[PDB]
A paper describes a structure:
DUX4, a member of homeobox protein family, is exclusively found in placental mammals. Compared to other homeobox proteins, DUX4 contains two adjacent HD1 and HD2 domain, connected by a short linker of 15 residues. Very recently, using next-generation sequencing technologies, a novel B-ALL oncogenic driver DUX4/IGH, derived from the insertion of chromosome fragments containing DUX4 gene into the IGH locus, has been reported in ~7% of B-ALL patients.
In the asymmetric unit (ASU), it contains two HD2 molecules and a DNA duplex of TAATCTAAT (DRE) sequence. The HD2-DNA complex structure reveals a clamp-like DNA-binding mechanism, in which the N-terminal R95RKR98 loop and the α3 helix interact with the TAAT site in the minor and major grooves, respectively. Upon DNA binding, Arg96/Lys97 or Arg95/Lys97 are utilized to make direct contract with the phosphate groups of DNA backbone in the minor groove. Compared with the Apo-DUX4HD2 structure, the guanidinium head group of Arg137 in the DNA-bound complex shifts 2.9 Å upward to form two direct hydrogen bonds with the phosphate groups in the DNA backbone. Inside the DNA major groove lie the residues Gln143, Asn144, and Arg148, termed QNR motif. The side-chains of these residues insert deep into the major groove reading the “barcode” of T1A2A3T4. The carboxamide head group of Asn144 rotates 30° anti-clockwise to make two direct hydrogen bonds with the A2 nucleotide.
Residue numbers in the entry:
A (entry chain C): 9 to 61
B (entry chain D): 9 to 62
The structure:
Amino acid sequence: RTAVTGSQTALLLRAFEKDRFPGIAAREELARETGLPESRIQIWFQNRRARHP
Amino acid sequence: RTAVTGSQTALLLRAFEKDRFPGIAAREELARETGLPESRIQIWFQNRRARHPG
DNA sequence: CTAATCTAATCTT
DNA sequence: AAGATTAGATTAG
């Protein structure tokens, strides 16, 4: 029940370009920064590593 | 490149009711019978699963 | 209408 | 965590 805002996307792309493998430390933060479950953020990083190496 | 003919459409539609979730083999087989890449057969089945069940 | 793509998610080893 | 694959949304013929 969630479509991502362009700002969240921009915020994840920034964290991506920084380091593509955020430990659960980075991710919880990124969950707070965005208002998304941590679970949903890991998925985002897993898919993006697979479709843009 | 695209443009599937009515005949290609005809034999896949038959195979559709035959197997609604073709494994990588069923599709690989179906690529030869039609002359379309397996990749394009998968898209065809996943698009049609969403636009026409039953 | 239909092919193709991009995303979110699940599952397997 | 990668790999494949699903559904779904959408971009286009």
